[PDB]
Amino acid sequence: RPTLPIPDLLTTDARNRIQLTIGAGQSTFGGKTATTWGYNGNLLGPAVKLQRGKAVTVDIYNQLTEETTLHWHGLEVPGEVDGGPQGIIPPGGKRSVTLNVDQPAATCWFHPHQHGKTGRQVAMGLAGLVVIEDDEILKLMLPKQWGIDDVPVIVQDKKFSADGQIDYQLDVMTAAVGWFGDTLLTNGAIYPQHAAPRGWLRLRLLNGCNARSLNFATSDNRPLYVIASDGGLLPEPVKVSELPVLMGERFEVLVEVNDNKPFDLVTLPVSQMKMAIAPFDKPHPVMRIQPIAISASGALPDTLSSLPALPSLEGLTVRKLQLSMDPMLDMMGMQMLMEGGKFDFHHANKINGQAFDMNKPMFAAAKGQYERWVISGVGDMMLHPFHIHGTQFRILSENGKPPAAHRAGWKDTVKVEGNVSEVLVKFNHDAPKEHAYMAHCHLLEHEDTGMMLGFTV
């Protein structure tokens, strides 16, 4: 097997600046070449390292032939750092953002957020990581050696035509169910191997698929110790035998590498509608872990962090959000699960009856105050991972039930699938009308066909 590629861990240079170049290039999958996009390279991107309480300047150079944006998924930052329309970077253009990090240590990520083409630009290969560190986590003695016992694992699927090129098409069908592919990639490679020393191995898991849910496990069913979610550490490690991960979500897990016994990270079959699984739906391997005689120094503490109690729900504003899809998309989405009109579909999917409008923010949210957002997909049976910018929130109810323990800490994504979710959000930064925050489904094709709203703080 090829070895697991390891994204560069970028820090500031001498002038407190980090340089990101958006460019097209060539990658090779299974023998055949493919035109890919990357940040500082042909595919994916580096891991930008940030320190809490400190500022960096990021210089972005769009060397593509079309417009793009750079959204910092999971960063609590003013709306300006994404920008709105000012956040567009034309081909050959450049754009500078200063990032002030004041949130707990976490794994976030960044990717394009272009109006209507987010799904395509991610499909082409643009995604990078953000590694946030603070005082608290560095005292914990977790495995921390980048690319050795602390490794990023970006899992994506891609659909390749027979010429080996990426086959993306935002047609009427992919707008209903999302863009799916038959090739599973880990950090760009097909089923790579990572050599890991004995002791604890730390995996930063990102589901970077356009539309596919993942369910991570090990081949020999050894447990995964969840230590962090989207927003950072849990109060204590949460042991699981399998780990569902929605599109755009991150979890950090420790896995025990206790012998010379090599094992696989796998993703398990996922129920499509609430539906059964025949044995010829099989687990697919993601990455092979190969132990080595070196013993690593990382540890797993009994206590990881301190999460504040949920504030009382009395006195908090309630904002309702109703996700809906065009019934034709939903219906034709089920016909495919087993297998008319003029109908523009670029604004088919809606929130509160409105397809997204770049100039029309749906409301303003309070700054520095917890609000109670209730997001419902009741009229619909498809999975919608709902993402909100500018915050790390607490899930009160996920799809009708209180969250699982490993999903009860800091999150920026919540499952909405035929039911109602309730989150507890606080926004610490301004986002005026020209630089408005977004809230949207992170099945990218749904977001490109209207399922998004802007809001100001």
Residue closer to Cu ion by CB (options 149, 447) is: 447
Tokens 């253009």 belong to which residue?
93
The residue range among 66-74, 91-99, 201-209, 406-414 that interacts with Cu ion, by the rule CB under 5 A, is 66-74
The span from the CA of 314 to the CA of 424, in Å, is 12
Give the residue, chosen from 13, 102, 135, 171, that forms a contact with Cu ion under the rule CB under 5 A: 102
Interface with Cu ion, residue 350, by CB under 5 A? no
Within 8 A by CB and 6+ apart from 270, the residues are 212, 213, 214, 215, 244
Alpha carbon 126 to its chain's center: 12
Within 8 A by CB and 6+ apart from 453, the residues are 321, 351, 352, 354, 356, 361, 362, 438, 439, 440
Interface with Cu ion, residue 248, by CB under 5 A? yes
166 phi, psi to nearest 5 deg: -70, 130
| Breaks following residues of the chain (C-to-N distance > 2.5 Å) | 339
Is 194 annotated among the ligand-binding residues? no
81 phi, psi to nearest 5 deg: -70, -35
Is 442 annotated among the ligand-binding residues? yes
Beta carbon of residue 211, minimum distance to Cu ion (angstroms, whole number): 9
Is 284 annotated among the ligand-binding residues? no
Beta carbon of residue 438, minimum distance to Cu ion (angstroms, whole number): 5
Residue closer to Cu ion by CB (options 97, 224) is: 97
Interface with Cu ion, residue 247, by CB under 5 A? no
Tokens 């699984």 belong to which residue?
277
Beta carbon of residue 94, minimum distance to Cu ion (angstroms, whole number): 17
Is 209 annotated among the ligand-binding residues? no
The residue range among 31-39, 226-234, 337-345, 431-439 that interacts with Cu ion, by the rule CB under 5 A, is 431-439
The residue range among 26-34, 37-45, 132-140, 440-448 that interacts with Cu ion, by the rule CB under 5 A, is 440-448
**Residue 400 amino acid letter:** G
Residue closer to Cu ion by CB (options 384, 411) is: 384
Interface with Cu ion, residue 415, by CB under 5 A? no
C-alpha distances in Å from residue 442, one per residue of 195, 228, 344, 370, 390: 33, 20, 21, 23, 15
Residue closer to Cu ion by CB (options 199, 248) is: 248
Residue closer to Cu ion by CB (options 438, 457) is: 438
Residue closer to Cu ion by CB (options 194, 384) is: 384
Residue closer to Cu ion by CB (options 196, 438) is: 438
Site string for Cu ion, 352-391 (x = CB under 5 A): --------------------------------x-------
Give the residue, chosen from 201, 362, 431, 441, that forms a contact with Cu ion under the rule CB under 5 A: 441
Interface with Cu ion, residue 446, by CB under 5 A? yes
The 3-state DSSP class for residue 258 equals coil
Alpha carbon 351 to its chain's center: 21
C-alpha distances in Å from residue 82, one per residue of 73, 96, 375: 10, 10, 24
Closest CA to 442 of 382, 394, 372, 364: 382
**Strand locations in 79-186 (E):** 94-100, 106-111, 128-133, 150-158, 183-186
The span from the CA of 136 to the CA of 253, in Å, is 18
Interface with Cu ion, residue 112, by CB under 5 A? no
Interface with Cu ion, residue 453, by CB under 5 A? no
Beta carbon of residue 202, minimum distance to Cu ion (angstroms, whole number): 22
Is 115 annotated among the ligand-binding residues? no
Is 346 annotated among the ligand-binding residues? no
Residue closer to Cu ion by CB (options 209, 438) is: 438
The 3-state DSSP class for residue 136 equals helix
The span from the CA of 418 to the CA of 378, in Å, is 5
Beta carbon of residue 428, minimum distance to Cu ion (angstroms, whole number): 5
Residue closer to Cu ion by CB (options 254, 439) is: 439
The span from the CA of 67 to the CA of 75, in Å, is 22
Interface with Cu ion, residue 95, by CB under 5 A? no
Beta carbon of residue 241, minimum distance to Cu ion (angstroms, whole number): 20
**Residue 40 amino acid letter:** N
Interface with Cu ion, residue 438, by CB under 5 A? yes
The residue range among 206-214, 240-248, 287-295, 337-345 that interacts with Cu ion, by the rule CB under 5 A, is 240-248
Site string for Cu ion, 266-305 (x = CB under 5 A): ----------------------------------------
Interface with Cu ion, residue 73, by CB under 5 A? yes
- Two tokens at 114? 């272009």
Residues binding Cu ion (CB under 5 A) = 73, 102, 248, 384, 438, 441, 443, 446
